Each structure stands twice: as structure tokens, then as C-alpha cells.
Amino acid sequence: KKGSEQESVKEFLAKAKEEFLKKWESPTAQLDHFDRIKTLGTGSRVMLVKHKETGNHYAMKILDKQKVVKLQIEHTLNEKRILQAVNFPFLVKLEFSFKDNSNLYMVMEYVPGGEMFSHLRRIGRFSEPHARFYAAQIVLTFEYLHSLDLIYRDLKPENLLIDQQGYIQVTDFGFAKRVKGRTWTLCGTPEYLAPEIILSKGYNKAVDWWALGVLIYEMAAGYPPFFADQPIQIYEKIVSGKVRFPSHFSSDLKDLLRNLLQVDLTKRFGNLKNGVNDIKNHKWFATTDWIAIYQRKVEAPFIPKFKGPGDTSNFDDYEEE
């Protein structure tokens, strides 16, 4: 039975790689086709827009060529090329992309449930079954991406949107990269960086598994495991090899997290002979029906409220520029 399940994963990934490669090797609209509505998020912006012809709403990522000045540029090409070639239930869909004299634009499906980040900070923490439901989707998404030699490199609740079924949509592929062995760019978000990134070591997809450990801890605790006011203090905590857990964490959860938040790459789950199955077959996931999650048959822990098309009530406000 587990043998049948493993053969079926092999089959699915072989077909997924064939489809990805067709689009990867052979990868529009214009700005006046959309009414800009509201900024949904911003960083070093994404706007809700409304397509004038069809009335459909989208999330438009706008990249200022005057800001993307850092050697930033490769990462932007990675993002567009990867998003146009992947296809998975928990990855945001890219619809259009175009550019003008000032900006690059990627137009994606609008996911109106808001960021996991908002919901988590509002309620404080998620119970373990609630956290597990989200974590299972990330596990499957990384099994898919890594099989295509893609590393994601920016997992955190800010980048996980909740859709109308209560499932996750992974957004922001700005640091995602196709990597056949190791890569060397120092990039990511401080609380979620693996030790080998901070230590300026060439690294591989195991940094995404470390970051899953940070995410599961933060979802279940309400704060991440390496927590300080300044990035340099965070980095010292990450490289030490020490993690402490809330007293309400189950022992199964602590065991899984000790194996993800493992500084020694010869021991870190996701990075061993059995690959992702050390994670999928861990006791903390014993209740998880992996195929039922993929097929979206599992009832979600909560469904965000929506008042209609173009509703932005589940997002925070930002200064409009």
C-alpha cells in the first residue's frame, strides 16, 4: 500500500516534469487594460486591479525598474519564467505579464482571503490540526517544486494567501530559482533563513525544509523559533543549534521540528535518503490524507468571509503612490 502510494507519486511527478519543461523552454496585456483599485501589499507593490473588458479582478505586481537596481534583476526573470511554467493547486496562477518604460507587471489571480500572516497575528496561534492542514499543503508544494529542481527560498506567513475554500495559495516567487545542485545568493527573510545561508555556504533545496520547520513552529506558537529585534541577533540564534518549544507543543510536533530545524545537513529531514517521505510519514502527519489534501477534499479550518467580487476587507491598508 505505501509501495503503491510511492509509485503513484513517482508517476505524478514524471508527468508534472514533462508539462513543466514544455512551458519552461517556450515561455501579455497592457496597463490601460486595467483599473487600479487598491494596494494589497508592498515591499522593496501588489495592487488589486479590475480588467476593463471582462470586469475580472486580478492582483497586479508592479516592479519599478528604477528600484530593481541591484544585480534583483536575475531574480525578477526567475520569478516570471517560473510562474509561467508551473501548475499546482497551491501555487498562485500567473495570467498576464508585460512591461513599459517604467515598470514590469505580472498579473495573477486575485486570492481575496488575505495573508495567513494577518489571520495568525489576529488570533494569536493556530491549533495543531489547523497548522497541520496548512503545513501539509506546503509539504506537497515543495515536493512538487523540488522535483522540478526549483527552490522557493521565501516561505513565511506573509507570502501565503488564503483562498475562498480556506486553502493556501503560495505567492511571491521573487527568490525562486531553478538549481540543479547548489546556489550561493544570500537572500530570504532573516527569521526563516537556514544556517547554511547565513554562513555564506553554498546551499540546496534543504533550506526550504528548514524554513518549513520555522513556519510550522510559528503557526503553532504564534511567533517564530529564532526571535529578536535585530537581524544579527536572529542569525546568532539560528546558527547556535538551540531551539526551545512552548509547553503546549505535542511531543510529536517537537520531534518533527527538531528534525527540520536541524543544523546538520546530514541529519535534516527532507535532505536524507528517503527525501520528503521522512516528513510525510512522520507521526505528526499520521492523520493527514495527502491525496485528499491535494484533491481539496478536506474541510478547511476556516473560510474567510467575502462580501463579493473585488472585496479587499481581508487585507491591511497601505499608502497609495
Place this chain on the structure above:
Amino acid sequence: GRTGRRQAIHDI
């Protein structure tokens, strides 16, 4: 620790 949204870092 930092409780608001966290910015990614693109180089060192």
C-alpha cells in the same frame, strides 16, 4: 522580536 511584516533581504 519583530511582530510586524518582515522584509526579505536580497544580498548580504
